[PDB]
Write an enzyme that holds these catalytic residues in place. Structure first.
Site, PDB file in Angstrom:
ATOM      1  N   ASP D  45       0.819  -1.206   0.000  1.00  0.00           N
ATOM      2  CA  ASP D  45       0.000   0.000   0.000  1.00  0.00           C
ATOM      3  C   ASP D  45       0.856   1.260   0.000  1.00  0.00           C
ATOM      4  O   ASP D  45       0.459   2.275  -0.583  1.00  0.00           O
ATOM      5  CB  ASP D  45      -0.944  -0.009   1.200  1.00  0.00           C
ATOM      6  CG  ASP D  45      -2.119  -0.945   1.008  1.00  0.00           C
ATOM      7  OD1 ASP D  45      -2.649  -1.009  -0.122  1.00  0.00           O
ATOM      8  OD2 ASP D  45      -2.512  -1.618   1.985  1.00  0.00           O
ATOM      9  N   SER D 154     -11.690   5.215   2.723  1.00  0.00           N
ATOM     10  CA  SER D 154     -10.777   4.086   2.558  1.00  0.00           C
ATOM     11  C   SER D 154      -9.629   4.121   3.558  1.00  0.00           C
ATOM     12  O   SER D 154      -9.032   3.075   3.842  1.00  0.00           O
ATOM     13  CB  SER D 154     -10.217   4.062   1.134  1.00  0.00           C
ATOM     14  OG  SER D 154      -9.311   5.131   0.940  1.00  0.00           O
TER      15      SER D 154
HETATM   16  N1  LIG Z   1       2.226   5.224   5.422  1.00  0.00           N
HETATM   17  N2  LIG Z   1       2.624   3.988   5.520  1.00  0.00           N
HETATM   18  N3  LIG Z   1       3.006   2.748   5.629  1.00  0.00           N
HETATM   19  C1  LIG Z   1       2.150   1.833   6.393  1.00  0.00           C
HETATM   20  C2  LIG Z   1       1.071   1.269   5.471  1.00  0.00           C
HETATM   21  C3  LIG Z   1       0.129   0.344   6.244  1.00  0.00           C
HETATM   22  C4  LIG Z   1      -1.026  -0.288   5.435  1.00  0.00           C
HETATM   23  N4  LIG Z   1      -1.969   0.673   4.811  1.00  0.00           N
HETATM   24  C5  LIG Z   1      -1.672   1.744   4.071  1.00  0.00           C
HETATM   25  N5  LIG Z   1      -2.810   2.307   3.664  1.00  0.00           N
HETATM   26  C6  LIG Z   1      -3.821   1.572   4.121  1.00  0.00           C
HETATM   27  C7  LIG Z   1      -5.200   1.667   4.015  1.00  0.00           C
HETATM   28  N6  LIG Z   1      -5.767   2.662   3.337  1.00  0.00           N
HETATM   29  N7  LIG Z   1      -5.955   0.733   4.613  1.00  0.00           N
HETATM   30  C8  LIG Z   1      -5.405  -0.262   5.294  1.00  0.00           C
HETATM   31  N8  LIG Z   1      -4.096  -0.382   5.410  1.00  0.00           N
HETATM   32  C9  LIG Z   1      -3.285   0.510   4.826  1.00  0.00           C
END
Ligand SMILES: [N-]=[N+]=NCCCCn1cnc2c(N)ncnc21
Ligand SMILES: [N-]=[N+]=NCCCCn1cnc2c(N)ncnc21
Ligand SMILES: [N-]=[N+]=NCCCCn1cnc2c(N)ncnc21
Ligand SMILES: [N-]=[N+]=NCCCCn1cnc2c(N)ncnc21
EC number: 2.7.1.23
Lengths: 260, 260, 260, 260
Positions: D45, D154
């Site tokens: 992500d 989101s």
């Molecule tokens: N900044 N950073 N690194 C840590 C990234 C952790 C995982 N992650 C990133 N976006 C996310 C999202 N929208 N929904 C769930 N999980 C997500």
């Protein structure tokens, strides 16, 4: 029996300090901020913490007492207008001493001990915070979030309370660890619940990638580089309060958070 | 030295019970469920609670031991396939006893005491739950929500944990109170934080309108009418465990909530 | 244009009701509690809920308005001393109508629909609460705890708020589900976070052992036996308010929980 | 129809990128990282967030698609071994586009706008964090703690979830604010509940003492000096995804936090 008095420095606390020194002058009480036996804090809890850390090498030889000029504090629990009765009983009186437990924080490199009255916190310098948590030489969890906070009994009412921690009565020799915005998905798992450890238990933090951490003890915040272990345990040293009245800890909690 | 063994009643635990009685028969060990000295639970933690409450009048005379046929339990911490080694050491062995604190619950009308291993909860019979909370004869708060839960150290891992409570190590003689969906607006105020009380502190609940409450002790739930006071304190009585191995409480917490 | 007025029944609200009927008599306004067009609630939010459920079959034909004699309410947002100005503008005035979303609750046996203004909750009749959670025909989780609460936007400030739920603005057509003291260990896993579902999403609860549940809609609590499915979705029907002034939802939240 | 592909840079994602460019070469598909129409992220992500911010000036002209080489992501929801079927349908196919709401963050001095996909956070540079919270030009609260986090729909599954926030479905045009370790006593009061604001609502943060803040948008963290106002609102701009399959948001939540 020597004494000294620190002040918040504002207009109100400085004038309250000079009126007590004048009152203490009618008694044969020597003012000595070098090696006192009675430390008096005037202002708030932050002033009491600074007054505490100014003499954390003579804790057995000192009985603390705090006056609050702003709000009601947990360590500064004496109304300003009650100073003259305080000066009277603190001079010709025997009173009684009350002791609270303290927290030892050890940091190793490639040792530096600290004494906290409220809490000690750990965060990361920039990158994500990732540490393994070891309890009495047993790997308990691998934390990743914003950080962790280890609290003293009396400090549960401070930062520990803001993290969902439980409020412990100061007569319990223990320490409480609370989590700061941890990550929990199907892969990474933390316990979530605050943890209360008794005397003679050792909670150790160990890095996983970054070895730089922003360790903070009470108000003092600092940065440590190339850290190998952060070691927590209840200190054998105890702070000593001087109580002239019955002011229960649970009553101070009430007046501070419910109503007063 | 007498013994007895309770079972979950299913197909697996009953057959494991008959194989231990046969093993205990090779030794001169009398089976006696009237006045035993070693109580053995086979099944889960609920079976251990029932086994505990079956003999809560002979706690000094009994050392408990639990076997788990389903999941891993906090009181039933012995793998089923390790029963033969358990029977051997429990017969010709001296082992060592471990004691946990317990919770006393007193109810008065217009007295009925109880002993809990996990927690005691209070709710209302129908209407809204409203109680005044008194701590050592000092009014602390006026709670209104779903109810309240007072936990033992070992019981913090149960219902107390689901209410945001902290997990306390069993070596600490204390009790923890946690809130159940309280109301907090500009008018009604509760503390919110879980509260940890030491030995010799008395938390008292007092009604405000309805005087009927659904008090539950561990699994036993009952209804009380025209209640005047609910009185909590740490019991002087302690449960006695029999440990043959090092299984740290913090390790049992790990295997139950992290991974195993 | 017909009208009717319900009262809390106490000494204060009944006298305030008779002074408005007398004021409404100077205008050619017919009182009719059978098929009114303007329903007026005097008392609290509970009185407004009863007034709402008294006419939940004529929601399009009715514009609601609430007066609060006790505290400030979220639906009863009119000071009692402002009733004469209310009677004046509610008679010769056009004002404007404001609509909030509602929650549909369907229960099937071996169908019974309901309309909620605040929330609908599910618990178990005695035994432990265990349900599978299905979201748009996809198994999401297997919950086990005390129960679950599905809230409306305006109802997030009620029971939903006590369960850690988020406060949604009423202009958002959605529903929020919150958990009640769930169990979470290495075996049983719930999401924990409150869930917000949009219009045209169906959350379905399905039993796993016991098929008896204590379903409660707003204040109305009842018991259902041999339940097959509990079906949640945002109703197409909407309540209609009548606003004469700007009283923002976020301002009502402020005055109720911050200060006023 | 142009395209480009970013990679996590490791050994696995770089080799997966070169096999798709070779596959895309059999079709008359021009690679162009200047003004593409289909952006492909390979890694996690965080790689998708960087790929998003690389082209946040052409959001209408781009349909995003993410591949995950490590764990399952919320934006990178395509198994690596399914790339050949992805290359086939992304070339000769019409598919369909899905759009999510975004968050606008405005900062004024004595203006600087930003676009976030997950969240925007505010903290203090050193001293305590104190801000007044203004909602549609109405003072709602005076926050003091560690900071605040405003989330997108989101993004509720990210940092917002760690702060107790609710998970919103992306079809809801809204933003959620959550608190970071606030202070709440008889003097200082915050709401505590997460707040969900609809489209066309403006949440404004205003300093009270220190005017330096550490504002962070998604992963990008920066420091601002002499700040006058931090302005939040739902952006009119929307990200565009390209879906070839039914992968419900609630199913992605399940596989990420429950089991997969
Ligand atoms: N900044 N950073 N690194 C840590 C990234 C952790 C995982 N992650 C990133 N976006 C996310 C999202 N929208 N929904 C769930 N999980 C997500
Ligand atoms: N660091 N600093 N400044 C902020 C001081 C905030 C109040 N405060 C300090 N100690 C406290 C304590 N033990 N219990 C409750 N409240 C306390
Ligand atoms: N009542 N009942 N049945 C439900 C039993 C659930 C598991 N459980 C029982 N005691 C426990 C304890 N002390 N610590 C952790 N987990 C425990
Ligand atoms: N059932 N009942 N009685 C208890 C009523 C408590 C106050 N209350 C009722 N509805 C509410 C609402 N929508 N928002 C905030 N507060 C509300």
């Amino acid at each position: 029996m020597k004494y000294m008095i620190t002040s918040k420095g504002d207009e109100k606390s400085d004038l309250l300090r000079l009126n007590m020194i004048a009152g203490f002058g009618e008694y044969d009480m020597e003012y000595d901020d070098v090696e006192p036996e009675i430390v008096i804090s005037i202002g708030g809890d932050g002033t009491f913490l600074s007054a505490f850390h100014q003499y954390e090498e003579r804790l057995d030889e000192i009985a603390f007492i705090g006056i609050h000029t702003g709000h009601l504090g947990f360590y500064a629990d004496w109304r300003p207008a009650e100073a003259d009765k305080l000066v009277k009983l603190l001079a010709k009186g025997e009173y009684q001493k009350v002791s609270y437990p303290l927290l030892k924080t050890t940091v190793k490199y490639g040792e530096a001990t600290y004494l906290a009255l409220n809490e000690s916190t750990v965060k990361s310098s920039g990158g994500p915070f990732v540490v393994d948590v070891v309890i009495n030489d047993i790997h308990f969890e691998r934390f990743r979030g914003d950080g962790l906070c280890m609290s003293t009994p009396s400090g549960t009412t401070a930062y520990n309370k803001s993290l969902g921690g439980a409020l412990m009565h100061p007569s319990i020799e223990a320490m409480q660890l609370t989590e700061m915005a941890s990550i929990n998905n199907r892969v990474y798992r933390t316990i979530g619940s605050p943890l209360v450890f008794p005397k003679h238990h050792v909670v150790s933090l160990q890095p996983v990638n970054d070895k730089d951490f922003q360790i903070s003890v009470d108000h003092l915040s600092i940065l440590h580089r190339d850290v190998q272990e952060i070691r927590y345990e209840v200190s054998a040293k105890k702070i000593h309060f001087a109580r002239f009245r019955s002011f229960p800890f649970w009553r101070r909690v009430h007046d501070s958070f419910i109503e007063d």
